[PDB]
Amino acid sequence: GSHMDKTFCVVVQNRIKEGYRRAGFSFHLGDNSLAAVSESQLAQLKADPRLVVQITETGSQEGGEGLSKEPAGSDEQKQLRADPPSTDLNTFTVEQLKAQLTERGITFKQSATKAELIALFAPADGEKSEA
């Protein structure tokens, strides 16, 4: 096979959805195999705290790794950390937007029919925020 090198094919078994995306390969809901690379694969797949990355070396029962912990260790910033709020735009029905836009200084006669004025209200005042 190979020697004097650390090349392995890795696969990410995910059970999220068919739209979680990734680096840019339209990662679907399932397992994707990785080509035999030095180590970038592992770090690239592990760098993303969403999917899983496991190395499978068919021909080496050495190691085992006695490291169970990893997520924890010197906590500095977290704040709850469990489930995304997702409670911001929801509070905006239809009559609020139209009443808030005008009261906010954003008239709407031609545009902002109903689907535009309800979507308009987005928390991104600055340059390019992602809330």
Side-chain angles (χ1 to χ4, degrees):
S2 28
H3 63 308
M4 246 185 72
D5 59 340
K6 253 106 183 256
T7 178
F8 27 99
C9 53
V10 107
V11 49
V12 289
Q13 202 261 120
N14 184 29
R15 207 151 193 162
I16 282 154
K17 58 154 78 147
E18 321 220 63
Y20 65 102
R21 300 307 240 282
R22 232 252 98 201
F25 309 91
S26 345
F27 271 26
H28 278 307
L29 191 32
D31 313 44
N32 186 321
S33 300
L34 166 276
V37 194
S38 165
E39 196 206 341
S40 28
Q41 132 251 311
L42 191 82
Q44 228 68 54
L45 304 182
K46 243 254 245 220
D48 205 35
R50 222 172 231 162
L51 315 324
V52 316
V53 51
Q54 313 254 270
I55 52 138
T56 53
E57 227 179 289
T58 180
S60 60
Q61 48 161 287
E62 254 75 322
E65 272 102 62
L67 232 304
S68 291
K69 265 219 178 83
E70 229 285 299
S74 209
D75 307 282
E76 223 100 285
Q77 290 110 336
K78 252 170 144 182
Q79 277 183 277
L80 247 66
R81 206 105 229 289
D83 203 67
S86 285
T87 313
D88 222 40
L89 179 56
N90 242 276
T91 31
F92 293 64
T93 297
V94 189
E95 63 196 270
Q96 246 109 131
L97 9 141
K98 59 191 59 132
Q100 226 83 70
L101 260 210
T102 15
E103 258 257 284
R104 270 212 140 281
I106 311 177
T107 174
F108 52 114
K109 257 129 271 285
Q110 268 226 73
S111 183
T113 336
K114 53 97 218 282
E116 296 274 283
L117 85 199
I118 185 280
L120 203 101
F121 290 89
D125 228 54
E127 221 185 271
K128 48 142 198 215
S129 311
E130 54 108 32

